[PDB]
Structure 1
């Protein structure tokens, strides 16, 4: 009776789920909660049940990239999840404004994947749910953590080559705030499946400035802590509606 990739049962799926890319990040989140229960670890998908401020919700890793995260999101969305919040990292597309360590809460995303397009026509928007977005912003100000807001580029390409020009500069000029690899996919899947979604992200560098060393995948520790508390806060607040 188990889900194919998450290897947990439908009965173990909570109304609220916090997803992250890195399985290691699940272990850092779970030790911040009041208690947890380890559930499964299959491939890159690590699932834990988090207990926080009297509420119960899953934390699950989805892996790097849209195709792999989509299998995670589908398994969640078709088996009872109502709210999914991604807490991720990102690169900055506004290096004058948004620096390594900064936190962005994103309402919408650029669909530079394939899987969303195999689900719905390209003209359809990757947009998060306002309530999820609103509660992430509200927790951040309650915790007195400055955050940015904007659009994320969700791109399937991490290492550009020099044949086809990358569109990242185009999107920067179009006022996209940040870039990562999974948010647009989450948003689209959630819209199609009537699941509310949201996204909060921590800058790990600037892809325009990698050749200058503007990169470190060791996330700024006090900001990673801040982001986590914001995410956990939002999840508990949203979970109360369904408990």
Structure 2
């Protein structure tokens, strides 16, 4: 303890009760934009940090790059230091081609544990599940902002480029009703459950991994405001030490 965070390279007194984590640090800037005010905090490797101010409340907006071990070090440094709520806003592909299309929004409550990091944390029998509150508040912002959302189960797969040798299960989990595929959410949920952190997550359909071989920015605008609004909503309760 002194002025730590090893990877975020921010201080432990800059960690707020609520955090919004995204993957691409250029989108920390596109979110920076719609807020009321901000404080840029640090930019180390894939990890751009920032104090966002929206509707009377402050909360970080921090990016974890692509994939679970790298995202895990970010989530881990947050909870060790005092994030109470962590919502991920990001992108995903559709596992339901003709129901979930490009630009639709899912608010996901559980995910498939297809990394390895959580498995080095807890036995794979464990659920990766978000917290209901976070999931409920996120859901009603959608409804107050009059914006359709799906809800569902996401598969957090570490293989982005499947292979000719082993069965990629994604069809398996499609037939099993999972809605979307992304890379980081199971990890968030497992760490959170372990360290007592309420997590949640919302995602915009980029594409469908099944038809790779073959505007949204409006929806992108909606999704940020649902996520910003939820963080504001959720930061309220803790505001005052």
User: TM-score range with shorter-chain normalisation?
Assistant: over 0.9
Q: Give the TM-score normalised by structure 1.
A: 0.97
C-alpha deviation, 1:2, in angstroms: 1.9
1:151 Cα offset (Å): 0.2
Cα drift, residue 241 of structure 1: 0.3
Q: Distance in 2 between matches of 1:236 and 1:183?
A: 21
**SS of corresponding position for 1:106:** strand
- TM-superposed deviation, 1:209: 0.5
Whole-angstrom CA distance in 2 between matches of 1:159 and 1:221: 26
CA RMSD of aligned residues (A): 0.7
Q: Report deviation, 1:126.
A: 0.1
Task: Give the Å deviation of 1:107.
Answer: 0.4
Q: Shift of residue 5 of structure 1?
A: 0.2
Gaps of 5+ in 2: none
Distance 2:98 2:104 in 1: 12
Q: 2: CA distance between counterparts of 1:234 and 1:16?
A: 10
Secondary structure, counterpart of 2:65 in structure 1: coil
The separation in 2 between residues aligned to 1:2 and 1:77, in whole angstroms, is 14
- Offset, 1:19: 0.3
Which residue number in structure 2 is paired with residue 216 of structure 1?
none
Runs of 4+ in 1 over 2 A off after TM superposition: none
- Cα distance in 2 for partners of 1:159, 1:92 equals 15
Note the C-alpha offset of 1:153.
0.2
How many aligned residue pairs are there?
237
Question: How far is the alpha carbon of 1:103 from its aligned partner?
Answer: 0.3
User: What TM-score do you get using the length of structure 2 for normalisation?
Assistant: 0.98
**Corresponding position of 1:17:** 19
**What displacement does 1:220 show?**
1.8
SS in 2 for 1:176: coil
Structure with the higher fraction of residues in helix conformation: 1
- After superposition, what is the alpha-carbon deviation per residue over 1:175-219, rounded to whole angstroms, capped at 9, x for unaligned? 00000000000000000000000000000000000111xxxxxx8
Distance in 2 between residues matched to 1:80 and 1:64, nearest whole Å:
23
Write the deviation string for residues 12-59 of structure 1: whole angstroms up to 9, x where unpaired.
Answer: 000000000110110000110000000000000001100000000000
Cα shift readout 1:90-134 (whole Å, capped 9, x = no counterpart): 000001100010000000000000000000000000000000000
- CA drift of 1:156 comes to 0.4
The answer to whether structure 1 residue 125 and structure 2 residue 127 are counterparts is yes
Q: Aligned partners of 1:179 and 1:241: how far apart in 2?
A: 32
